[PDB]
Amino acid sequence: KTVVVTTILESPYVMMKKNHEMLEGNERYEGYCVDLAAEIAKHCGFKYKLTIVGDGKYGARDADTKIWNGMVGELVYGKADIAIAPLTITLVREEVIDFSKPFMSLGISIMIKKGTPIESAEDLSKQTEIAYGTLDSGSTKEFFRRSKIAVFDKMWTYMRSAEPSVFVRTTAEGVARVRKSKGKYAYLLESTMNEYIEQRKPCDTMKVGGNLDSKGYGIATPKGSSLGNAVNLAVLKLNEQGLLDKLKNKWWYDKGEC
Amino acid sequence: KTVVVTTILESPYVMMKKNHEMLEGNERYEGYCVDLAAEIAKHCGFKYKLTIVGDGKYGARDADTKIWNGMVGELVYGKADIAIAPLTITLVREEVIDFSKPFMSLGISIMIKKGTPIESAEDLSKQTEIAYGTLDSGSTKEFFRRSKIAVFDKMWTYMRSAEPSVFVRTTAEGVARVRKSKGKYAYLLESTMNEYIEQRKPCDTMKVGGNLDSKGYGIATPKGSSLGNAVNLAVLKLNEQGLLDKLKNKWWYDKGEC
Numbered sequence A, B: 001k002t003v004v005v006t007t008i009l010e011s012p013y014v015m016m017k018k019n020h021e022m023l024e025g026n027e028r029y030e031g032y033c034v035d036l037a038a039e040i041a042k043h044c045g046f047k048y049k050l051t052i053v054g055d056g057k058y059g060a061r062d063a064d065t066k067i068w069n070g071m072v073g074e075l076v077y078g079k080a081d082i083a084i085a086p087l088t089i090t091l092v093r094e095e096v097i098d099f100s101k102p103f104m105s106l107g108i109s110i111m112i113k114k115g116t117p118i119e120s121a122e123d124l125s126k127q128t129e130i131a132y133g134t135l136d137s138g139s140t141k142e143f144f145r146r147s148k149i150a151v152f153d154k155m156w157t158y159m160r161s162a163e164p165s166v167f168v169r170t171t172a173e174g175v176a177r178v179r180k181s182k183g184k185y186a187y188l189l190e191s192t193m194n195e196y197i198e199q200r201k202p203c204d205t206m207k208v209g210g211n212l213d214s215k216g217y218g219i220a221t222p223k224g225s226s227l228g229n230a231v232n233l234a235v236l237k238l239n240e241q242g243l244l245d246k247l248k249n250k251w252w253y254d255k256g257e258c
């Protein structure tokens, strides 16, 4: 059976091709995760169909309703067989789905409009003129919600109580907000995304300070999946053979506009 | 049943305390991995005994006998129940044992005396006045042996046939060779180790250039272990709590003497 792959429209991982209306199926998309999916499939020997997650979310469980949304939910309820996206390997998710070893290492980082007088998370927490937030609904927002580290908890208390909301629906929304704030809005996001945006026109944003944490993105499958073992071995083989480094250069730097 | 943990004396992971002669059992040791073992054991709810791997090796498979040595071999043959050490998650090992998600991210790096006219892997391959090598029975030596990247293979053809052997049995021997070679020997090793040594007196070595790859260290258990699942969730929990960063600071920079 054709393997159903759930993914998310997040540049440069998965994007619509310019003439996608002319194309069909898997040919409608391009990106780092599109290239990765084709390779994982080749190495594991399966045919597949890329589908964009219905609710445009990564994956979180609603307390009360107890229902999982996003790509994680698609795997949990059997709507998809595998998730190939910039999906963070977390404990809460690992309890309901399986993840391959990481295909990309990263950490939460700070994005500023060039010139903003901020060089760390401590800087952000110690002031209030410059607003800041995260991508609503993902692991970055959860990192702050769950943190017991003083600086990060102080940051969470401000963000959750901030009005209007400092949280954004999409990365693009966070980046445009940074770009239009005149330095009055900093954005907390995954490092690899920060580095990508730093190489895109108008070349007016930059990553400052070190990463707030260290983690990774993994390929996810439902628990008990027949694909789990092979998918994991494929990720390790691809990393060892240099393909992963090659894909990042391709979508990040080879195509860099700054 | 008390769990037998296999580990390796590699600083600052596992080191015999200064006051060891007046101590017994697990108390004789200190280090990043000693604190880690204690954390894992507390969270997984088990009692353990730290044992230093019989042959002092990480783990590799004998091409002729098909027999696994090192900590890997201790798990494969059932001599040990879990390996808590700076053991790299690799494809060949993943085929015979299980690994938790990485507790540490790293990459192969270059260690030079200081003043040594080398700044990259390319520089090393462009000349022959300065010798260079790696550790044995490890993922680093394997890396160059399996690499197709022009530079890394050119480096391997030199290392393979190098007279005398540029390979060393332990990190200590590699670092000692760099320090006592008047800058005529550069050492290829894992980044975390490189960074640690750079902060240790005589403060005469330094890490140059970027990492040659991206990998991770994991806690290993034999296939089908009743400990595997719990250990993986424990690693994830410890990373998300902020403990793994706390442990690296403590052993790397809080104790740095440069």
Ligand SMILES: N[C@@H](Cn1cc(Br)c(=O)[nH]c1=O)C(=O)O
Pocket (backbone or CB within 6 Å): A058, A059, A086, A087, A088, A089, A135, A137, A138, A139, A140, A141, A171, A188, A189, A190, A193
């Ligand atoms: N990877 C996250 C989603 N995600 C993505 C980006 Br880009 C970010 O900046 N923050 C996030 O939480 C997850 O898995 O929830």
Ligand SMILES: N[C@@H](Cn1cc(Br)c(=O)[nH]c1=O)C(=O)O
Pocket (backbone or CB within 6 Å): B058, B059, B086, B087, B088, B089, B135, B137, B138, B139, B140, B141, B171, B188, B189, B190, B193
């Ligand atoms: N982590 C490796 C062992 N190891 C260690 C150090 Br330090 C190094 O520089 N190279 C290695 O291969 C393995 O697991 O084989």
Ligand SMILES: [Zn+2]
Pocket (backbone or CB within 6 Å): A039, A042, A043
């Ligand atoms: Zn391939």
Ligand SMILES: [Zn+2]
Pocket (backbone or CB within 6 Å): B039, B042, B043
């Ligand atoms: Zn604990």
Ligand SMILES: [Zn+2]
Pocket (backbone or CB within 6 Å): B062, B063, B064, B065
């Ligand atoms: Zn032999």
